[PDB]
Design a protein around this nucleic acid. Structure first.
Lengths: 244, 244, 244, 244
RNA sequence: UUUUUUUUUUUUUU
RNA sequence: UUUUUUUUUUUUUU
């Protein structure tokens, strides 16, 4: 009945630091977890999850993250395959609940495979290898997707780590402007402000150990035995420093 | 059938100023009323309204004003708590009917508790206390939310009142640009043009007396016994003058 | 079966100028017709249409063109009145089919009455009389709505006609920027490019004769017996030439 | 349960280039096919498809590509004709599935008839022939629609082909800015970047042979017996060079 | 904002 | 586009 008094009496109770912090942790933003993606893939796909994840990586890389929209301009065969994949994995577009699968999340969780596919798929990506070669010669094809950040060892020596991320950022700059048309008229620093947080989140995630991530970088020819980046990565990193 | 004659005859009847003014008052915009928020909280929550309002203040401050959207990136436990809060209090996003509760309205109506929570929640807010400290040292943590304006005594001496509002405006400038991305490229004066009207409406509302508001400012350490602002408030008020 | 041949055979038939022009006229854009608005008002409202149109003019002028949205911030009494008006007249928001009523269309069709209401409603409009007085002293209150263009005699001498339209355009410039926030950063010429076509359409409509429109302008004190605009209109027209 | 091991094992299997490429082809973007448009026209219309396609070309050229929206501002007769056309041909707006007809697709597939209609419809198009005449005298009326690109012979001698495309591009520049308001503040090169890919796709499509296309250009008076463009085409090609 | 943004390739329809 | 645009007034929640 006395609303002012009800508000004052409510304000009278002091803030319990322990209780309030327990609530902030409970309500906190839950970041991308590759384990949840693989769990959902296994749950919906069973023994077929790996073969279907290969198909979804090709869809994510060559057609994007909108399953129903990409179906509108597709062959009868492709349309039937994507329809079955949407029904089975309850595929959604964009950025929904973490209880949902997307083509981008499938590609991000299985980063090791995604980055290998990029060598073959190079000329069918939103920004082709040929386009990247015109900006920096022999541009590393394995860096040509945002999921590459999930293969980056954060324990690498500072300069070597910055060179890998700058090289990858040269792709991220071109890619973001092609798939996001409002970034086309913005500066390198403005476009970078949209991709650095999800890139760093992938670099610093606990999915795939530091050692296994460095083994991938070495196997793909991005770093040597001492973790020193290749001449192609150094070129791409310098091309990023110069880039508009 | 003779529409021109009907329009002429309609325009011929003299203007009844009493009738027109009665309709302007009847159709007038209905401003925010904290009493209605607390009434709805009591009606839906019963004996649980205060414990649930504490939870909703943590949600408003650390996750925002979109209950269904924040649930998409939350733990199973948090998701279950927010789901129950939405169902019980019929929580809506944005700016709906005044018959509806929102997390922002709960935080605004119980501004006294909201501002106390800010000391503990400082590093989980869209603009942290550490960021505010880099603009003005020992920035008042109690001013780091738009609901703080509801704790401002408009009867304070002019210079003391301007110092409190300028200090608080230093936060509102950073906060508005972080939560509203189209304001990021606009000047201090353009951003201020989006927060001054709701700020002044809270400062001049009839909810919580001038005396009780000044008791809160004194207890939060913002003003002394004479209503003179703290050195920290003065430093922020001055820092707002040279802020871009 | 032979799609190329089907396309060529279709292209072989020559375009019949008479037939094609009959189709362009049939499919042509149908402009605003005040007769259709009054007919719908009479059809839904019966003997109550005139009293309800007075209410809808007050709603259009002081709250805008979104019946369900304005109801969200309104008294129980006002909410009940607008709810009844929406159900009875099947009121829609924005720019729907010409078979539908809107608050803006009601105000536009009964321009004579709308412009008289503006003298009383001046301080409750999106751009007040006081605001207009600061740009041009004793700004004509009868010109303070887009529906005023429906009271303009196009047969007036050129200079007198341009002076009335320039004076009214000074309001249209302020009004368009207030109700349309994307026009706020645009030049006078860009803002004018959004209001000149609907303004000219109202000036050149066949609803209310040239003579009756000049009688309204004379009665409201906008032009003298010879159709020469008042000193206030000339000031407003010069203030428009200068305006940013 | 061991998600890191599952992701490592998945990334360990060698890339089957044959399998991946089979999936890129299956999932590849399906371009516009005029044969599919005519097939759907025949399937839904039967013996009435040609008479209805004439009506749909008038709608596409004078009212646009939004069937339900154009109906909102149309006569009772036109509204009834468009309602019947939407129901019969399951007409959609915008850019939907290739299994769907649109007014733009009907006009594009039967480009030969569309371009003939332009001579009669000139003053009812988004950019009129009179406006085009002010930029380049006696502007070719047959080029005043994007579907004209479907009548261009790519086997024409280089200079003659460039002259036809530059002349047509003078229209596409004006047209794109009128129907797309965000292009109004952009440069000639920025606007051209939105129309060159669909233009070139029509120029290089396999629908209607090179020889039949050149027969259309000759019959429309655009090129002589040797494929040399008319003086009017040359003047427009030259006017495109200095266009802003 | 915190692995997001998924654009073009007969579109954009003011 | 062709009587449209209906913003603020505890909002904007990235």
């Amino acid at each position: 009945d006395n609303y002012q008094e009800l508000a004052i009496q409510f304000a009278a109770q002091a803030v319990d630091r322990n209780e309030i912090e327990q609530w902030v942790r409970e309500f906190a933003y839950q970041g991308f977890d590759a384990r949840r993606v693989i769990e959902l893939l296994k749950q919906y796909g069973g023994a077929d999850w790996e073969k279907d994840a290969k198909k979804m990586i090709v869809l994510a890389l060559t057609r994007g993250n909108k399953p129903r929209r990409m179906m509108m301009k597709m062959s009868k065969e492709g349309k039937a395959t994507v329809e079955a994949l949407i029904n089975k994995y309850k595929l959604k577009e964009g950025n929904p609940s973490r209880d949902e699968l997307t083509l981008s999340r499938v590609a991000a969780a299985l980063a090791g495979r995604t980055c290998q596919a990029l060598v073959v798929l190079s000329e069918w990506l939103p920004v082709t290898g040929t386009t990247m070669d015109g900006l920096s010669p022999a541009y590393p094809r394995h860096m040509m997707h945002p999921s590459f950040a999930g293969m980056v060892d954060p324990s690498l020596p500072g300069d070597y780590l910055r060179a890998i991320l700058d090289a990858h950022s040269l792709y991220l700059l071109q890619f973001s402007r092609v798939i996001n048309p409002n970034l086309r008229g913005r500066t390198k620093e403005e476009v970078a402000a949209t991709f650095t947080q999800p890139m760093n989140a992938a670099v610093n995630s606990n999915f795939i150990s530091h050692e296994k991530r460095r083994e991938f970088l070495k196997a793909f020819g991005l770093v040597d035995s001492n973790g020193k980046p290749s001449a192609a990565v150094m070129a791409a990193a310098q091309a990023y420093k110069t880039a508009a």
